[PDB]
Amino acid sequence: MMSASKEEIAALIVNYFSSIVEKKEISEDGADSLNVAMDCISEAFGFEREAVSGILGKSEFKGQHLADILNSASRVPES
Amino acid sequence: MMSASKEEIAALIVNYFSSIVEKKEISEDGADSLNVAMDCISEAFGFEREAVSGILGKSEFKGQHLADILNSASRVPES
């Protein structure tokens, strides 16, 4: 959309993980793994875990998850 | 194109981080953090980071990255 900067992508990544655990699409085994990984990602790029709501707002990715976005990507391999 | 499978999305996520560490786009600390983060994603979804090439090779994301895909993907919030 805009530029797909590290912060733009990061927000969608953590949002995707949040979506998975929300509707419980993963077992508690991997749930805690993504739980901590999400925080590591947040610290790496320099943003708060609970600040994802603001990032999705300031960026033009509101109402869009990494899943739905990729789901709309009809990449055709012309190998 | 063939929907958005969890493993396919995860493959792009780890690939994205790999594309960052391959050219040291992230700091020394971030690199270490991303390394373990990718490991967590791999074990949680049920795949290996060293097998990312095999996943992308099957998926319609071969030769693409999470960055370029998200960059091209553009949605306009009518609000």
Next chain:
Amino acid sequence: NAAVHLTLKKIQAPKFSIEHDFSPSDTILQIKQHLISEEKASHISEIKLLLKGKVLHDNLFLSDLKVTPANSTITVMIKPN
């Protein structure tokens, strides 16, 4: 034997790295306690250890740690919740 050699490394700056020998009868909680003793952490709840992506819970014993000469490094994550 009882000599459980573990390497504690923090991925987030400052990236410290210390090696010590523990016991198979010790739990992940013991490592956390040890980390605080070495003045590398403040609270137990801030210390989240991981191994190959798998989160190491306090109830986990060091005897169940799948640590080999290759992955003898434990991921030390420290965050205020």
